[PDB]
Amino acid sequence: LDTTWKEATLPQVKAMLEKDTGKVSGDTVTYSGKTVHVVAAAVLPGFPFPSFEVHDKKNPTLEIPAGATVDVTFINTNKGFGHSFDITKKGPPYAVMPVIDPIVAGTGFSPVPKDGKFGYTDFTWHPTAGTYYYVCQIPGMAATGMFGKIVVK
Ligand SMILES: [Cu+]
Numbered sequence: 001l002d003t004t005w006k007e008a009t010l011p012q013v014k015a016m017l018e019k020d021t022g023k024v025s026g027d028t029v030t031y032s033g034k035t036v037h038v039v040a041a042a043v044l045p046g047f048p049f050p051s052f053e054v055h056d057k058k059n060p061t062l063e064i065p066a067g068a069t070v071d072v073t074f075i076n077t078n079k080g081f082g083h084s085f086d087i088t089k090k091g092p093p094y095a096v097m098p099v100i101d102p103i104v105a106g107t108g109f110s111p112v113p114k115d116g117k118f119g120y121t122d123f124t125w126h127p128t129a130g131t132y133y134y135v136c137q138i139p140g141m142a143a144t145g146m147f148g149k150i151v152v153k
Pocket residue numbers: 042050082083084136137138141146
């Protein structure tokens with residue numbers, strides 16, 4: 001797993017969130033091009049706990065073209081928590097301790113927010129076509145809705 005992290009101030013977090021290259025319609029975010037840039041955050045201020053936000057949407061379904069390089073940036077903005085972002089082929093419902101191996105791409109547990117800053121990381125992903133899920137592995141979070149769907153085709 002990706003377990004290397006950097007720290008960002010709030011202006012840096014805002015700058016990064018705006019680099020998501022998706023296009024929104026309803027609760028779907030659609031990506032296009034040779035390399036696509038997904039920027040996800042764990043519980044942005046005021047969004048429902050527990051959830052991921054991508055392109056300002058709660059747990060949206062990501063539509064990714066087959067053959068694209070997927071550059072994921074994951075930011076943990078939720079004070080007191082160490083959320084992860086892990087992609088799996090296993091769908092819901094998830095147990096309190098989700099059983100989702102193998103994790104095809106994703107992170108360990110993130111640093112908890114500290115010192116006025118937020119931990120984030122970047123990883124790359126080259127999926128085969130199919131359906132995937134992005135899931136948090138902190139106990140109980142996926143069971144209470146902290147996941148979303150990815151369609152690569
Ligand atoms: Cu989480």
